[PDB]
Structure 1
Amino acid sequence: TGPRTCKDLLDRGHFLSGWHTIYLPDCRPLTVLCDMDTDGGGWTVFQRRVDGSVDFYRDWATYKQGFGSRLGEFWLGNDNIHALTAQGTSELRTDLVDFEDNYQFAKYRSFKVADEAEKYNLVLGAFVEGSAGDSLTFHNNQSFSTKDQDNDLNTGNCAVMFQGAWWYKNCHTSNLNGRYLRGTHGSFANGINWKSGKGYNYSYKVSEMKVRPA
């Protein structure tokens, strides 16, 4: 048939990382970023923060379809992300870089997101390994919330209090779609924050969330 993941492509001898066009179960094309280097390679990347050039404080319609630049930061979009994580079993990996260049990460057994009707519900496996600690199981079975759509289990607005979008609760222990605040920041838990990573007051330089059939 044809390539359906970055796993396929790597196996087919595409060894350099970059944008490749894979085929959704639905088929229908869809060009994605492939990380062929990290942890044996073949990861499809749906989120990337690198320099704070793209504004992530976006609404529902935008997160649905995705936004950003293949040239920089981006969200692959929730419909795509669902299509992508729906049919085998993908394992999520997160990669975080502080402004020292100390890498830290988190690996998870499985990773699925429900369709838009299910509100892009997070179905997270269990923390495997990762020097950044588990700052995401906390958000299991919890709908995705955006500025123009409050779904969080909180009386106020998590998306707005911490200026981001996430599967918020009351509210978060992770906030990778938050403000790009450049290292330690006075403001509270509103940067690119990994609770168990560098706490609620440090915003990483680099954030990447990627998948790969386990």
Structure 2
Amino acid sequence: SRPRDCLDVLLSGQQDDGVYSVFPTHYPAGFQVYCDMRTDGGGWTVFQRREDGSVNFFRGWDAYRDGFGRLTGEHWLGLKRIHALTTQAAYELHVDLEDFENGTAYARYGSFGVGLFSVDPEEDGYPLTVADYSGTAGDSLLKHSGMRFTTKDRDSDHSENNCAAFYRGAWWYRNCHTSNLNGQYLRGAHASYADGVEWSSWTGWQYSLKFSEMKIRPV
């Protein structure tokens, strides 16, 4: 009746990929998400998808807090929703990647959260918790652990520049990044430095991936 996430949806007997209502502990109004019911037995709540460059990801603080795009296509679920999900239980993160040569890879993180113990996660900049990498894509996220989220209009990074403005995205920037999955949809190899859909451990700092999906499941 009130699944808290896509794993509750799966265990209630819904086996199809698609859009479902979930109701996190501290977000009782609930909201709709895309559930991946296939990957590693299923029950994954999607919070980011790139697939075709139809949606603008070069967005400000309010858009990254509140979410944008469509659940059936390219979207960012919103940091307020990702906080409501990742604080209610211990989640793992799955990242699926595809290049423009139909190569695929994945990274799995045994631990993932945003603003986990922040009294005001927005004020506190939704800081990243991430640990325990496995998979085929290589690790491009551990270096970001403990970093606040930065947008073009709200700088909490460890550059004297704004990493989000400079690398044309929004991420838990350090000085500045090994991943940038919210970067410009530049479609494969590019001359500009690290400002595309980058997962550096797989395809370097000058290759914008075709497809990315970031999704969570209780450990």
The corresponding residue for 2:99 is: 98
Give the partner amino acid of 1:6: C
The structural deviation recorded for 1:32 is: 0.7
Of 187, 193, 216, which residue of structure 2 is paired with 1:211?
A: 216
Show structure 1 runs of 4+ deviating over 2 A.
Answer: none
Is 1:119 the counterpart of 2:125? The answer is yes
The corresponding residue for 2:183 is: 178
1:29 and 1:134 map into 2 onto residues whose CA distance is: 32
Task: Deviation per CA, 1:19-61: give whole Å up to 9, x if none.
Answer: 1001111221210110011121110000000101000000001
Is 1:110 the counterpart of 2:116? The answer is no
Of 133, 136, 139, which residue of structure 1 is paired with 2:138?
A: 133
With structure 2 as the length reference, what TM-score do the two structures score? Answer: 0.95
The corresponding residue for 1:72 is: 73
1:72 and 1:61 map into 2 onto residues whose CA distance is: 20
2:40 and 2:185 map into 1 onto residues whose CA distance is: 26
2:95 and 2:208 map into 1 onto residues whose CA distance is: 15
Whether the aligned pair in 1 keeps the contact of 2:19 and 2:72 (CA below 8 Å) is no
User: Which runs of 5 or more structure 1 residues have no equivalent in the other structure?
Assistant: none
Whether the aligned pair in 1 keeps the contact of 2:93 and 2:217 (CA below 8 Å) is yes
The corresponding residue for 2:171 is: 166
Count residues in correspondence.
Answer: 213
The structural deviation recorded for 1:102 is: 1.3
The corresponding residue for 1:7 is: 7
Identity %: 52
With structure 1 as the length reference, what TM-score do the two structures score? Answer: 0.97
Of 161, 172, 175, which residue of structure 2 is paired with 1:156?
A: 161
Give the partner amino acid of 2:218: P
1:27-66 to 2 correspondences below 5 Å: 27-66=28-67
1:105 and 1:70 map into 2 onto residues whose CA distance is: 21
Give the partner amino acid of 1:189: A
What secondary structure does 1:209 align onto? strand
2:70 and 2:196 map into 1 onto residues whose CA distance is: 21
1:108 and 1:182 map into 2 onto residues whose CA distance is: 26
What secondary structure does 1:125 align onto? strand
Give the partner amino acid of 1:157: N
1:71 and 1:101 map into 2 onto residues whose CA distance is: 21
Task: Deviation per CA, 1:139-196: give whole Å up to 9, x if none.
Answer: 0110000000011100112101110000001000000000001111111111100110
The structural deviation recorded for 1:12 is: 1.4
The corresponding residue for 2:118 is: none
Task: Deviation per CA, 1:55-99: give whole Å up to 9, x if none.
Answer: 000000111111111231100001001001002100001010011
Aligned-residue Cα RMSD (Å) equals 0.9
User: Which runs of 5 or more structure 2 residues have no equivalent in the other structure?
Assistant: 116-120
The structural deviation recorded for 1:118 is: 2.1
